[PDB]
Amino acid sequence: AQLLAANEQKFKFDPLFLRLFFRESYPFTTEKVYLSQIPGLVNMALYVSPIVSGEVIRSRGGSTSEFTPGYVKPKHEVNPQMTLRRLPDEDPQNLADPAYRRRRIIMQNMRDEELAIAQVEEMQAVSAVLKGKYTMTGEAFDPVEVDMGRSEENNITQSGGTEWSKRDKSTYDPTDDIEAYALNASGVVNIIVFDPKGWALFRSFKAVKEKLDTRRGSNSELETAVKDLGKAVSYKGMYGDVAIVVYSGQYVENGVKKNFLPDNTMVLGNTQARGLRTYGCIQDADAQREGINASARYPKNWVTTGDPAREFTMIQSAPLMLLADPDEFVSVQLA
Amino acid sequence: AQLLAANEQKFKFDPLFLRLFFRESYPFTTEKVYLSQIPGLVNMALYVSPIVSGEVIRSRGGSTSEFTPGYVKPKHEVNPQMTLRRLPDEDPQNLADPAYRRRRIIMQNMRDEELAIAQVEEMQAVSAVLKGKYTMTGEAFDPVEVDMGRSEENNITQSGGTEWSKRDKSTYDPTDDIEAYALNASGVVNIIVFDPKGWALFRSFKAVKEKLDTRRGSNSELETAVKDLGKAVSYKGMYGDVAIVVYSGQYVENGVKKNFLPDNTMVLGNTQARGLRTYGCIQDADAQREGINASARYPKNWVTTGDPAREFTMIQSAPLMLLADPDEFVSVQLA
Amino acid sequence: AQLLAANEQKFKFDPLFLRLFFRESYPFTTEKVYLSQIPGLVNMALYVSPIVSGEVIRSRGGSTSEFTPGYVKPKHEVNPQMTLRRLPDEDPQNLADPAYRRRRIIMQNMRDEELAIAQVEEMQAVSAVLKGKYTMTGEAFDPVEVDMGRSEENNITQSGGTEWSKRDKSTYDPTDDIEAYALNASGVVNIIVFDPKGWALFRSFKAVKEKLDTRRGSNSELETAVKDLGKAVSYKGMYGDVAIVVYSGQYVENGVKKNFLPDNTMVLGNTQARGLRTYGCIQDADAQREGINASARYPKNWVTTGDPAREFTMIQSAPLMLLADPDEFVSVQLA
Amino acid sequence: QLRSWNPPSESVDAAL
């Protein structure tokens, strides 16, 4: 059992979703998300006559304001019985210390913990901006469908009508489809991040390959983001006007591993779409009596006396991240 | 209701227009802009004989001296019912204080306010140096067209005749067009800032890509400006003699978001073009009896007693920023 | 015979394999490698219901956990009968000292020793990520094949079907093959390091030479790595999206020298692939009674009394470095 | 015999 302050990572490397589209964090002192409580977009046009001023403007009463945040509280043991991750030859005598082994093993345990919540949050993000629906579900828990409201024109499919696979691999240009799906996106699209084989049949067209610019032509901080997360986001290059990226991230589930992304999917939208990170109550007596009922995360190291007389690291959170405008992204399944 | 002095930002990050071309602020004690009153360029050549001296020289009577400044006075509520922006873990106990929540929420409210007036001012700037016309307009207000006087050769179009899209993507050099449009600009052009796809088809020509220098070769403080506003101005690099920039700024309107820039446009001119920031009267009894009738901005925090018995933050301004020489920039719509 | 602490090099210059892909060192107190003992990738998805928590999660029992580490213990003599490497004119009077000659000759001897183990380890690495098979072999020792499990699609060949040599040297683009081999690599490929003539026929295609960017466009620390090891890794430049490198390292065997790399080979994978450096027991009475049974390397200087009454420097190690994901790299023999 | 014991030529502090 070590203090709360032993929670230093400086490792925030989420794959460009919770850090770039979903910056809009709202931890609450209350259980649910109350979209009426969030101001979101403000009623933002009307003025008043040059004699007096008008009424009082409020948070404009969101129609649906009741969903259950994913209160996730996992834990692990940091029992000093293992040989640990030994960074090359930094004096294993301190590993021989139970104190250093226990502290850096709580380091390792907790980092596994937040990357676990981060990967489940990224699955929530990919569900969110791929269908507008999120499955708040788990065993011994009712499945609540949390819908931002993704429209039908945001779910139009490439296989409908003519498929890119069922097209000329040399002369056909899918740019026409690119603006066709981008027009009904309530904004400009500046990233065309694909799943791998989706980008494969996208680039199979020649027009794509002599239309794209392999050069840097550094447009924004997206190159810096790729250099940071050189793991699963791949900056293919410029398609001229728009940036071409491929995400091949993978989640390692209970017995097997598989990619986050489905077979062939796309979301057309902006890099500055508004993403909410509403956070529920944290059900920990420590959190309430020290005021961490409204926060992002909560770690603790703590000893059980009695039957499971041991010591554990416990991580608690409650995210219900969504997208403010589901119509911002057009979600297309590809050929 | 908190005092006037609670208006500390130190956040002036306008996108290189009102800070670099339009430094020339003229807040007035009078309603309109009186270009005859502004000295502008001074009659600046003639001397007198070596016996006596000549007549008195004045502000040389601007022909048109009557336009309506955009007196913008929005407001918001800072009602202590929200959970606010919680910067990571700086003692949320003070957020629990109504005093600290109210003061930093008036901070947040007012900063939204000046960035709102800044973004509408940037739309005014982009209209100004893209067509020489500005639409002083709003509901319950007559639309006044404020024209600096942009000439026809400053509005000549690339699609006229031969288009860059309708050219050789490999051998054609658009530099010839670059000096063709730069010659009738009443000066030297040293920034070639494009909108994104405009720069895309500009660089599609090979001659561009082996003529441009990707290196720093730090010419001026424009690199410092880009480092400051790494958001939407992108320093592509050197084209050799001239700097290549791309602006992809976006305004988030009432229900949707879209870029400031049109599809494919260009303005050729200097970085030291003269930009006027004439400012009208501020219609606030506080402003008049304390002498802020001639200023840039005016904040206030204030309580309404009675029907809307509440408390608000009110921001008032009246900009009518224009360009002294509309002929300084040649405005071209691209292929 | 000089003490253990006389083992100071500060010279770790392995060719980007054991330092960049294979950082994951696991020295053991036990003879073999027990992949079941290594946690490797952790079962990393499942949570528990918001009522109680679930079972205990372990190291997920690697199927094969028994291979023989390459316990390498060579030695040399540092007999003070040679004239040594004389760095230019730093007072050869100390070389005339038997003390200084013996200490800097044990320096030279031992550095030869770890660079020997490093070069044999690099041959192990090149076998590993070129076929997934490693030959744990030596005279008076059974040859154990240590297989990570490289799949067939990771061993698909360029000569199969159409060869790059048997293609148009001007119009054909091998980028199509690049993504063809990269798609079945379980991730993104960001280095295309070739052996010399492999890169030669790669670049023989024009499309390659006007698609590649010779410029720095410094992407990552790989330029720093090349500046460090300017010997045998050659940063050709940017191919646009991906980095182009060539390795021409050479090992100098018993009577002759020859390159590490085969004639024309390629491995497509990430720069952050997981590489294990499991290390076996160190069979030295000194190592056991001072606890260096679980470490990287062990030097010693020591005198033999009797028939070989002399003094030697002895170096002992036991690496069995492998790759966690053999499917991470696609190994292709070229045209 | 001067081999197993060697004096440098320098100030005594930096020689010891």
Curated annotation (Swiss-Prot), chains A, B, C:
Record's keyword terms, sorted: Capsid protein, Host cytoplasm, Late protein, T=7 icosahedral capsid protein, Virion
Any Pfam family hit: Phage_cap_E
Main location (coarse class): virion
InterPro entries registered for this protein in UniProt: Major_capsid_GpE (IPR005564)
GO CC annotations, alphabetized: host cell cytoplasm; T=7 icosahedral viral capsid; viral capsid
Keyword 4Fe-4S assigned: no
Location in the cell: Virion; Host cytoplasm
Record's keyword annotation contains Kinase: no
Gene3D superfamilies reported in the protein's UniProt record: capsid protein of prophage domain, putative capsid protein of prophage domain like
Functional description taken from the UniProt entry: Assembles to form an icosahedral capsid with a T=7 symmetry. The icosahedral capsid is about 60 nm in diameter and composed of 415 major capsid proteins. The assembly is primed by the interaction between capsid assembly protease and portal dodecamer, and major capsid proteins assemble cooperatively to form the procapsid with the help of capsid scaffolding protein. Major capsid protein forms hexons and pentons of the icosahedron. Viral genomic DNA is packaged into the procapsid through the portal vertex.
HAMAP family cross-referenced by the UniProt entry: CAPSID_LAMBDA
Subunit text: Homomultimer. Interacts with FI protein.
Assigned protein family: Belongs to the lambda phage major capsid protein family.
Protein name (Swiss-Prot/TrEMBL): Major capsid protein
Organism (species): Escherichia phage lambda
UniProtKB/Swiss-Prot annotation, chain D:
Record localization: Virion
Superkingdom of origin: Viruses
Post-translational modification: Proteolytically cleaved by the viral protease during capsid maturation.
Coiled-coil annotated residue ranges, if any: none
Transmembrane segments: none
Biological role stated in the UniProt entry: Forms the portal vertex of the capsid. This portal plays critical roles in head assembly, genome packaging, neck/tail attachment, and genome ejection. The portal protein multimerizes as a single ring-shaped homododecamer arranged around a central channel. Binds to the terminase subunits to form the packaging machine.
Subunit structure: Homododecamer. Interacts with the terminase complex composed of two small and one large terminase subunits.
Sequence similarity: Belongs to the siphoviridae portal protein family.
Name the UniProt record assigns to this protein: Portal protein B
Residues of the full protein shown: 34 to 49 of 533
